[PDB]
C-alpha cells in the first residue's frame, strides 16, 4: 500500500509543496517535493490525496 509510505522528497532541489497521506494522523499533509522521482504518495491537492488514499 503506497498510501502508507512515508513522503519522498527525492534528489532534486526544488521546493514544491505537495500532499501525502499520513496514515498515523488519518489525513493528508503537506511536504516538500524536490521536483523529480516522485513516489505514489505525492499529490497536487488535498482532494486528490483524500480520494486516492482517504481511510487507508
Amino acid at each position: 500500500d503506497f498510501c502508507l509510505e512515508p513522503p519522498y522528497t527525492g534528489p532534486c532541489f526544488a521546493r514544491i509543496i505537495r500532499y501525502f497521506y499520513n496514515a498515523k494522523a488519518g489525513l493528508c499533509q503537506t511536504f516538500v517535493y524536490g521536483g523529480c522521482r516522485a513516489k505514489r504518495n505525492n499529490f497536487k491537492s488535498a482532494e486528490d490525496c483524500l480520494r486516492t488514499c482517504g481511510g487507508a
Partner: protein, 223 residues
C-alpha cells in the same frame, strides 16, 4: 544554500525567483525576455520575480512578470535527469538596469578547479529546515568528471558536472534548483540534483550549460 553567505541586495542581478504562490525554484535571466532554469522546475502558472533580495517583502526593486511560454529540453529524461534544462519566455520584457541584468552564456566549458558563484533562496540547513528571506551565495569549485562519477556511480552523464566540497558543509539544497552557477562572468551550470544537502563525499550535480548554447540561442530566436 548550506554554508554560504548573504550576497547583499541585488549583487546577483541575473538571479530570478520562480513563484507559484510561493518560491519553488530559481532561474537566470539571459536576456530581457528569457530565463533559463531546470526542466524539473516546470510548472503551470509561473510568475517570474526579478530584482528580488528579501523574497518575503516588497522592497521596491522588483518586477513580477508572468511566463508566456515554458520550453523544456526535448530530450529531458525525468528518470536519469539528463538534459535538465528549460527556457521560460516572459510575457513582457523586463526593464534592465543595475539591479536587474542578464548573465552571459559561455563561449566554452569550464575546467575542474574553476571557482564559481552559486546563489539561491533554498534551505540553509543540512540537517533540518531554515529557508532564508534574503539571497544566499556560495563560492565552490568545479570538480573533475572522475571524482563526480566516483561520487555517483552510473548516474553522471556528459551533460552534468559536480561542484562543491567533498568534506561537505557547503552546497545547494531544496529551493535552489534552476539557479545559476556562474564562473568568470559566464553561466556554466544550473542547480539540479544531489544526495541530501552538504553531505560529505556527495557534492551537488549541475546541468552543464556549455553543451546547450547552440540549442538555447536558436530556441530563443524561433519563439
Amino acid at each position: 544554500i548550506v554554508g554560504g553567505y548573504t550576497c547583499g541586495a541585488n549583487t546577483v542581478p541575473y538571479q530570478v525567483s520562480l513563484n507559484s504562490g510561493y518560491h519553488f525554484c530559481g532561474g537566470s535571466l539571459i536576456n530581457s525576455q528569457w530565463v533559463v532554469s531546470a526542466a524539473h522546475c516546470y510548472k503551470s502558472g509561473i510568475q517570474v520575480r526579478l530584482g528580488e533580495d528579501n523574497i518575503n517583502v516588497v522592497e521596491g526593486n522588483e518586477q513580477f512578470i508572468s511566463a508566456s511560454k515554458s520550453i523544456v529540453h526535448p530530450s529531458y529524461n525525468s528518470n536519469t535527469l539528463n538534459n535538465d534544462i528549460m527556457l521560460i519566455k516572459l510575457k513582457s520584457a523586463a526593464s534592465l538596469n543595475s539591479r536587474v541584468a542578464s548573465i552571459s552564456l559561455p563561449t566554452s566549458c569550464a575546467s575542474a578547479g574553476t571557482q564559481c558563484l552559486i546563489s539561491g533562496w533554498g534551505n540553509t540547513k543540512s540537517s533540518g529546515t531554515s529557508y532564508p528571506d534574503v539571497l544566499k551565495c556560495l563560492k565552490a569549485p568545479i570538480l573533475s568528471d572522475s571524482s563526480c562519477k566516483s561520487a555517483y556511480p552510473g548516474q553522471i552523464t556528459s551533460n552534468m558536472f559536480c561542484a562543491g566540497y567533498l568534506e561537505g558543509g557547503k552546497d545547494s539544497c531544496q529551493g535552489d534548483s534552476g539557479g545559476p552557477v556562474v564562473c568568470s562572468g559566464k553561466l556554466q551550470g544550473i542547480v539540479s540534483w544531489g544526495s541530501g544537502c552538504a553531505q560529505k563525499n556527495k557534492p551537488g550535480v549541475y546541468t552543464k550549460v556549455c553543451n546547450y548554447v547552440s540549442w538555447i540561442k536558436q530556441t530563443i530566436a524561433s519563439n
